[PDB]
Design a protein around this nucleic acid. Structure first.
Ligand SMILES: [Zn+2]
Ligand SMILES: [Zn+2]
Lengths: 107, 248, 209, 47, 186, 51
RNA sequence: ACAGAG
DNA sequence: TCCAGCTCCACTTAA
DNA sequence: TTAAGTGGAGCTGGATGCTCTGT
C-alpha cells in the first residue's frame, strides 16, 4: 500500500535499519519503525461455481436430522453453502431436489 | 459422463493463481517482509484440480523476476510465502508492489495459450457424448494431455496442423475448412477445385499463401512477379542478378 | 502425481516401440501390447523407478539388413540437455560402436547442443525428439494417411512411367514430423496412400528436399 | 506525490494502477520543478 | 526442482490451516522498548483517504445544513468557524461610493444586523437578507487542514501574525432563481 | 500586495522519527561543509521545513 | 479533381 | 487503414 | 570473465474493385 510522509508528502519506501525495518522518505529524514504486524489484504475474485457443482458432484454437507426439502417433503436433496466471490462475502445457501418424476432447482 | 469431462477441461484451460486464492496479502514484520498467499483449497476440491502448495511453489520461478526457489516456502498445505529480493536492474527493493499485482498472473494448472473452453453436447436421441471446444493456439498441448483422445482432434489454423501433424494433414485441413465455409453460406463447390487449390498450396513441403510472398516462391517468371505487386523491385533485382526469364 | 508421470513413461515407450516397428527394426509382439499394469513390472512407480539408464533401448537391430545395424533410444533425465550429456551418449555409442541414436528430451534442448547434432559426424546421426510429440502416434491420427517409404527400384519405375526427373515431384521437408517419424533423408521418395470418399484409394508421391 | 495521487483518485485500485508511475519517477532524480523542466527541455525538438 | 509433485485425498482441517497461518507471522520482536525502536503516535504515516488516515491503530453519511445548525446550538455551545460563500452581488446599493449599478458586496456595507437566517421545517435553510430570501447549501466537505489566520501590518515593515482557529465546514449560498423569477416572468 | 506568505517550521531531532544518518548527509549536500557565513541551516543537520 | 450509372 | 522483413539489444550456455 | 547463437521489440515498406458518362 502507498503510505506518504507527513512532512513532505513524497512516497515512502520500506528499508532496513539497525534495529527495525523502516518506512523511509527519499527526500527528508523522516522514518517510521515497523514495531508491530501490519497487513493489507487484496481479496481477489474467485472462479464461477455455477457449472462446477452441477451433475452429481462430490457434495458432503448433508448431516443426520437434516431438513427435508420444502416441496417434496423428503430428504432426497442436497444443500450446500459457499462463498460465490472472495471469503469476505457472507456465504449464500442453495439447494437442489432430485426425485422420481420430479426435477426442480431452488434457492 | 460429465465428471470425466470437467477434469480434462480444467487440465487444459488457463487457471490463474489469483483465481484460486482467497486472499493475497503483504505482511510487514520487524525482521522481514514477504507476500503471503493462502490457497482456497475448497475451490480446489470443487474444481477437481491437481494443485496444492508444492505445485504453486513449482509454478513460481518460471518467468517471474528471477525469484529463487529458496525464497519460496510451503509452511502449510495452503500458505505460500514469497520473500522478495533486489532485482538490481532498474528496480528498488519496494518491488513488492510489482509482485503484489504480478503474482496473481502466474499459471498453476493448464495450458498457457488456451483462452477458454466449453463442454459441448449433442442432441440426437441415440446417445449423449461430450466433445470439447478449445479456443486456443497450441495443438500439440491438447493432443498430449491425459484424457483427451489425441487420435481424433482437429483445428482451424493450418499452421498449427502443419507444425504438429505434417504437410498432408495441412492439405486435408485446407480442403475441409474451405468446404465447410462454402457450405455454411449456402454455396456448393465440387471438391476437385478446392482439392486443386490445396495441392497447389502444399507442393513444396510448406504451406504457401496466395499473397505476394507465396507467389514469389511458386512462380519464377520476372514479368509474372512484376505484373502483380511490387513492380519496380523485381525489375531492379532481375537487373542485378542478370536473371534471364522464360516466356513460357 | 506418480500416476500421470508413469503413464507418460508407458506411452512414450510404447510409441517408440511402434516407431521402431515401422522403420524396420526388430520389435517382438509382447512389447506392443504392453499394458500399464504390465508396465508396472520391470519398474514400479517413481522413486524406485529409474528414468535415465533403465528404460533405454539397444535391443533394436534391423532384422532386414544386418544384426549389427543397431539404434539407441535414450531418456535424458534433466529437462534441458547440454553438450556434456551428448558427449556422454557419444562416448557410450563410440564404445558400443553403434551408428544411430534417438533422444527423448523432457522439455527441450539448449541451442548449442541442437547445433552439435548437425556437426557431430556424417556417420554419427542423431534424431532429437521431444516427448510431448511422442505421447501420441502421429501415424494413427485420422488426418495423416499411410506413408510407405519407397526403395530405389520402385523410384526408377516411377520415373519411367511418367518420364520425369527427380526434381519435378512434389516436396516434403526434412523437418516434417512424419518425415522425422520414419527418419527419411534428402533423396528418398515417399508414397502417400490418400483415402478417398468412396472405397477407392489415391496414390501420390513426394520427394524429400 | 501525495497531491498528484489526490488529483488522480483515492480509490484502492486507482492507486494500485497509478503506483508504477510514481515508481518510475522516483527512479530518476526528478523531485523538484526545475529538475522536471530541465528533464523536459532535454526532450524538446528545437525549432 | 522435483517436478513430479504428489497429492492426497485427505481434507484439510480448518483450524489446522488457521493455526499454521497464525504461527507463520504472529511472532513479534516488539520487546525492544527502546528510544530508536519507539514510535511517535502523533506522526503516523498518512494513509491516502484523509478521513481514513489511521492504517495502524492502538488496538460516512453526508451532512446537511439543518443538521449542522442543530448540533452547534443543542449538542454543544462551543463556537465553530464557518467558511461561507455568498453570491457575487448582494441586494444593496453602494452608499455614496462614487458609483453604474455595479456589484454590491460585503466590502461596501457597514456593521449592523445585515440579515436574518431562517431555518424551516423539512430541512430548508434560507438567508433572508432584506426583501430577498436567498438559499443556503453545504459545499464540498473539506477534510484537510484549514487555519483562519490574521495578518497585521501595524507598521511599515514589521508586524504580528495571529492564528484564530480552524475551519471544518463550508456553506455555499445561491439566489433562489425560481422564487426571484416567479414574481415577474419573461 | 501579491500576497505570498512563506513560513518556516522547526522539526525536532531527538525524536525517533528523524534518521540522523540521512540528516547529516542532506545537510552536507545542501550546506557548504564548513562555510556557515550564509547558510540555510544553522547546525550540522536539517532542522527546518520551509513552506 | 468531383458527381453519377450498373 | 492492416501485415510480413530487417535490424538492434539483452539472455542464457560454455570455455 | 566473455564469445556467441537466439529470443523479443521497434522500424520500415507495401497494398487496398471494375468500367463508362459528363464538366
Ligand atoms: Zn518525507
Ligand atoms: Zn426432488
Amino acid at each position: 500500500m502507498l503510505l506518504f510522509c507527513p512532512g513532505c508528502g513524497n512516497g515512502l519506501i520500506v528499508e532496513e535499519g539497525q534495529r527495525c525495518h523502516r518506512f523511509s522518505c527519499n527526500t527528508c529524514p523522516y522514518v517510521h519503525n515497523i514495531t508491530r504486524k501490519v497487513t493489507n489484504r487484496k481479496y481477489p475474485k474467485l472462479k464461477e461455481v455455477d457449472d462446477v457443482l452441477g451433475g452429481a458432484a462430490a457434495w458432503e454437507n448433508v448431516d443426520s436430522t437434516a431438513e427435508s426439502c420444502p416441496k417434496c417433503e423428503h430428504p432426497r436433496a442436497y444443500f450446500m453453502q459457499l462463498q460465490t466471490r472472495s471469503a469476505d462475502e457472507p456465504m449464500t445457501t442453495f439447494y437442489k431436489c432430485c426425485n422420481a418424476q420430479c426435477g426442480h432447482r431452488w434457492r | 459422463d460429465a465428471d470425466y469431462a470437467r477434469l480434462v477441461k480444467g487440465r487444459i484451460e488457463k487457471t490463474l493463481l489469483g483465481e484460486i486464492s482467497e486472499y493475497i496479502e503483504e505482511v510487514f514484520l520487524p525482521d522481514d517482509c514477504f507476500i503471503l498467499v493462502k490457497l482456497s483449497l475448497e475451490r480446489i476440491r470443487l474444481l477437481r484440480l491437481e494443485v496444492n502448495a508444492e505445485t504453486v511453489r513449482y509454478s513460481i520461478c518460471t518467468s517471474k523476476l528471477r525469484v529463487k526457489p529458496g525464497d519460496v516456502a510451503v509452511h502449510g498445505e495452503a500458505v505460500v510465502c514469497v520473500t522478495p529480493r533486489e532485482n538490481s536492474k532498474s528496480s528498488m527493493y519496494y518491488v513488492l508492489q510489482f509482485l503484489k499485482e504480478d503474482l496473481p498472473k502466474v499459471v498453476v494448472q493448464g495450458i498457457p495459450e488456451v483462452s477458454r473452453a466449453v463442454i459441448h453436447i449433442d442432441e440426437q436421441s441415440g446417445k449423449e457424448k461430450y466433445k470439447l471446444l478449445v479456443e486456443g493456439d497450441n495443438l500439440r498441448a491438447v493432443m498430449a494431455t491425459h484424457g483427451v483422445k489425441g487420435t481424433r482432434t482437429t483445428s482451424n489454423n493450418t499452421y498449427e496442423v502443419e507444425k504438429t501433424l505434417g504437410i498432408e494433414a495441412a492439405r486435408t485441413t485446407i480442403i475441409n475448412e474451405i468446404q465447410y465455409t462454402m457450405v455454411n453460406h449456402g454455396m456448393s463447390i465440387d471438391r476437385r477445385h478446392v482439392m486443386l487449390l490445396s495441392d497447389l498450396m502444399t507442393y513444396k513441403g510448406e504451406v504457401l499463401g496466395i499473397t505476394r510472398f507465396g507467389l514469389a516462391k511458386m512462380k519464377e517468371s520476372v514479368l509474372m512477379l512484376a505484373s502483380f505487386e511490387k513492380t519496380a523491385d523485381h525489375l531492379f533485382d532481375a537487373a542485378y542478378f542478370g536473371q534471364k526469364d522464360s516466356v513460357c | 502425481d506418480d500416476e500421470e508421470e508413469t503413464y507418460r513413461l508407458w506411452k512414450i515407450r510404447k510409441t517408440i516401440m511402434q516407431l521402431c516397428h515401422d522403420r524396420g527394426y526388430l520389435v517382438t509382439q509382447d512389447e506392443l501390447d504392453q499394458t500399464l499394469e504390465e508396465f508396472k513390472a520391470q519398474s514400479g512407480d517413481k522413486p524406485s523407478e529409474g528414468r535415465p539408464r533403465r528404460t533405454d533401448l539397444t535391443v533394436l537391430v534391423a532384422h532386414n539388413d544386418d544384426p549389427t545395424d543397431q539404434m539407441f533410444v535414450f531418456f535424458p533425465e534433466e529437462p534441458k540437455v547440454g553438450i556434456k550429456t551428448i558427449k556422454v551418449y557419444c562416448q557410450r555409442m563410440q564404445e558400443e560402436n553403434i551408428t544411430r541414436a534417438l533422444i527423448v528430451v523432457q522439455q527441450g534442448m539448449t541451442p548449442s547442443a541442437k547445433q552439435s547434432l548437425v556437426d557431430m559426424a556424417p556417420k554419427y546421426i542423431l534424431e532429437q525428439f521431444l516427448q510431448q510429440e511422442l505421447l501420441i502416434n502421429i501415424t494413427e491420427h485420422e488426418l495423416v494417411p499411410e506413408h510407405v517409404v519407397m526403395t530405389k527400384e520402385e523410384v526408377t519405375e516411377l520415373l519411367a512411367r511418367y518420364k520425369l526427373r527427380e526434381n519435378q515431384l512434389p516436396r516434403i521437408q526434412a523437418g516434417d514430423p512424419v518425415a522425422r517419424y520414419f527418419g527419411i533423408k534428402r533423396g528418398q521418395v515417399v508414397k502417400i496412400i490418400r483415402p478417398s470418399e468412396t472405397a477407392g484409394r489415391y496414390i501420390t508421391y513426394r520427394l524429400v528436399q | 506525490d501525495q497531491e498528484i495521487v489526490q488529483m488522480i483518485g483515492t480509490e484502492e485500485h486507482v492507486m494500485a494502477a497509478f503506483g508504477p508511475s510514481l515508481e518510475e519517477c522516483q527512479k530518476a532524480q526528478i523531485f523538484t520543478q526545475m529538475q522536471a523542466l530541465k528533464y523536459i527541455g532535454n526532450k524538446v525538438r528545437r525549432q | 526442482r522435483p517436478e513430479v509433485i504428489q497429492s492426497h485425498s485427505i481434507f484439510e482441517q480448518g483450524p489446522a490451516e488457521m493455526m499454521k497461518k497464525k504461527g507463520n507471522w504472529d511472532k513479534t520482536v516488539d520487546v525492544s522498548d527502546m528510544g530508536p525502536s519507539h514510535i511517535i503516535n502523533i506522526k503516523k504515516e498518512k494513509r491516502e483517504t484523509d478521513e481514513e488516515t489511521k492504517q495502524i491503530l492502538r488496538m460516512l453519511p453526508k451532512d446537511v445544513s439543518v443538521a449542522e445548525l442543530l448540533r452547534e446550538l443543542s449538542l454543544t455551545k462551543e463556537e465553530e468557524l464557518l467558511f461561507l460563500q455568498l453570491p457575487d452581488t448582494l441586494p444593496g446599493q453602494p452608499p455614496t461610493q462614487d458609483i453604474a449599478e455595479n456589484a454590491c458586496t460585503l466590502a461596501d456595507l457597514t456593521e449592523g444586523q445585515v440579515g436574518k437566517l431562517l431555518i424551516r421545517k423539512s430541512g430548508r435553510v434560507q438567508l433572508l437578507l432584506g426583501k430577498v430570501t436567498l438559499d443556503v447549501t453545504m459545499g464540498t466537505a473539506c477534510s484537510f487542514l484549514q487555519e483562519l489566520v490574521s495578518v497585521g501590518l501595524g507598521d511599515s515593515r514589521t508586524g504580528e501574525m495571529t492564528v484564530l482557529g480552524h475551519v471544518k465546514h463550508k456553506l455555499v449560498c445561491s439566489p433562489d432563481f425560481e422564487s426571484l423569477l416567479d414574481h415577474k416572468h419573461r | 500586495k501579491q500576497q505570498k506568505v512563506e513560513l518556516e517550521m522547526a522539526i525536532d531531532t531527538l525524536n525517533p522519527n528523524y534518521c540522523r544518518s540521512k540528516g547529516e548527509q542532506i545537510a552536507l549536500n545542501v550546506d557548504g561543509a564548513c562555510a556557515d557565513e550564509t547558510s540555510t541551516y544553522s547546525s550540522k543537520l536539517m532542522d527546518k521545513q520551509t513552506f
